[PDB]
């Protein structure tokens, strides 16, 4: 696995932008909500048409939506990012709509992008635009600062952190990378920003073997799927479910489930009994 596949550079982050806007050009599948009409009236005032107070627009092709964009790291003004458009009123469908000018604000309350474009919906009330938002401002980055760069593991593990440190040391030389915890690995990097990009290009393509990790059993209590990871061991026991008795991975337990009618989701309750009896060498996680 390449380092870039299983890790991210510290300080090189994404940012989330959110804004309110109106979607027009709907085939009569718009809203009549008070906030939609209020926003529509304000927008019309912005163009020189001001209705008398208390006038009902009777609009049916306009829907109020919430626009969200994720700003990739090193985003420069003039670039385009995707936006997700979701209806917040009572519009039946956003299919075929057009997002009007909406300003996307950061967590500090400043506008960083402007979103327009045509919605592509499949849920008819959520659509996407491939280049809806144009980046208008930059977010500063700590990437070029300091005397080292840091890799953050996507899956935290002490062994994976140490193996990535060894991979860099073998490639470059001794005392070059060090694991500071189960997630972060610090690599000494050049001070020049151009040399650091060239340096990081060679390092992020290094190959190493991530560790297997702790043995876990993942149970989706609402879907019924049971994922048993590697290194999970079930201690032998006599399991009596329904009217039949079986002796002890899931293959034997699934057969015991199939013996009686019961249900494939009855296996989720057999594991909990095994966990209480100490017959599982691992972690039973319910998601």
């Amino acid at each position: 696995a390449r380092i870039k596949d299983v890790a991210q550079v510290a300080g090189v982050r994404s940012n989330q932008l959110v804004g309110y806007g109106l979607v027009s050009g709907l085939p009569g599948t718009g809203e009549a909500n008070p906030f939609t009409e209020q926003s529509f009236a304000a927008m019309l005032q912005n163009f020189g048409i001001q209705m008398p107070p208390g006038t009902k627009p009777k609009i049916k092709n306009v829907a109020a939506v919430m626009v969200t964009a994720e700003l990739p790291p090193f985003s420069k003004p003039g670039q385009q990012v995707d936006v997700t458009v979701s209806s917040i009123g009572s519009a039946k469908s956003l299919r075929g709509g057009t997002l009007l000018q909406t300003f996307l604000k950061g967590l500090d309350g400043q506008v960083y992008a402007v979103a327009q474009g045509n919605l592509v919906v499949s849920n008819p009330t959520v659509g996407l635009i491939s280049s809806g938002a144009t980046v208008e401002r930059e977010i500063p980055n700590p990437f070029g600062r300091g005397d080292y760069i840091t890799f953050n593991l996507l899956e935290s593990d002490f062994t994976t952190a140490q193996r990535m440190a060894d991979a860099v040391n073998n490639f470059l030389g001794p005392q070059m990378a060090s694991a500071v915890d189960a997630t972060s690995v610090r690599v000494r990097a050049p001070r020049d920003v151009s040399q650091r990009v060239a340096f990081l290009s060679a390092i992020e393509n290094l190959e190493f073997d991530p560790a297997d990790g702790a043995a876990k059993i993942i149970v989706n209590s609402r879907t019924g799927t049971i994922v048993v990871g590697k290194h999970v061991r079930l201690k032998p026991a006599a399991v009596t479910h329904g009217g039949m008795t079986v002796a002890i991975t899931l293959d034997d337990l699934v057969r015991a489930v199939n013996q009686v009618g019961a249900a494939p989701s009855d296996l989720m309750a057999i594991l909990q009994a095994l966990k209480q009896a100490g017959a599982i060498e691992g972690q039973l996680i319910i998601i």
Binding site: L172, G173, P174, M176, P190, R191, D192, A198, F199
Partner: protein
């Protein structure tokens, strides 16, 4: 600015070109400049040659400065002045002795050995040539292993050999068999050896015809052995001189044993 010849981390590669018990050759291609070759050879003494081989030959003899420059990705570390060499005209740069081992050591620490000099082909301007340490460790381990598995004798040490026979029998002594095994190892690993001269001859104890018969039987046994190593029959030469041409005083027990001997002389095509 200046011309710096170094392999970027994406370009740096080290290779073990010759890996035999007679030679070791670790090669680092310096892009746009040439090669850096470390060579060790089978010998009784510690030997390493470093050759900076250039595509465009050295224009003039120049004083060269060897420094141990830290790589860019090592801020806060200073450069160590290693030494001052001389690169000669129309010859590859050569560093030998302890300095070549020191270059290997500075590469082991993760540093860049840098040769700086004024290039004749470059309007007599100062240029730098650096050896990258990227992808050096594994090939340095392989190089150290091959150096470990080097013969402890050279062609000069075995080219002339004199072996002795036992008092009774057609077999060589223990030490003579050990030396013959050394010769066989060197021959089997060296393809440049062309000629083998064998001159068996014995003591005066037996009759002249008997001496000649013993000497010729011994010569033929040695010729068959040398054939077993893979040399073609047109290369081996064997002659039995019997009890003639004594090198020691026949009559003394030690002298007769001295004369009961074979001469083996190798000849190479380097």
């Amino acid at each position: 600015m200046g011309k710096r010849y170094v392999a970027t981390p994406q370009q740096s590669q080290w290779e073990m070109v010759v890996n035999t018990p007679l030679e070791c050759q670790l090669v680092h291609p310096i892009p746009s400049f040439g090669d850096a070759v470390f060579s060790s050879r089978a010998n009784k003494k510690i030997n390493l040659d470093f050759e900076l081989k250039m595509r465009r030959p050295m224009g003039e003899t120049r004083n060269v400065s060897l420094i141990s420059m830290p790589p860019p990705w090592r801020p806060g570390e200073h450069a160590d002045r290693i030494t001052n060499l001389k690169f000669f005209k129309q010859f590859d740069g050569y560093v030998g002795g302890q300095t070549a081992w020191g270059i290997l050591s500075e590469l082991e620490k993760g540093r860049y050995p840098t040769f700086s000099y004024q290039d004749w082909q470059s309007r007599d301007q100062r240029i730098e040539v650096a050896l990258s340490s990227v992808l050096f460790q594994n090939k340095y381990n392989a190089f150290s292993d091959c150096i470990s598995n080097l013969l402890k004798y050279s062609f000069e040490d075995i080219a002339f050999t004199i072996l002795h026979y036992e008092r009774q029998g057609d077999q060589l002594t223990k030490a003579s068999k050990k030396r013959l095994s050394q010769i066989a190892d060197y021959i089997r690993h060296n393809q440049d050896i062309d000629l083998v001269l064998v001159a068996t001859y014995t003591d005066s104890t037996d009759g002249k015809s008997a001496s000649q018969s013993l000497s010729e039987r011994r010569a033929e046994s040695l010729r068959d052995y040398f054939q077993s190593l893979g040399l073609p029959e047109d290369r081996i030469q064997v002659q039995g001189y019997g009890k003639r041409r004594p090198i020691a005083d026949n009559g003394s027990p030690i002298g007769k044993d001295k004369n009961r001997r074979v001469v083996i002389s190798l000849g190479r095509t380097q």
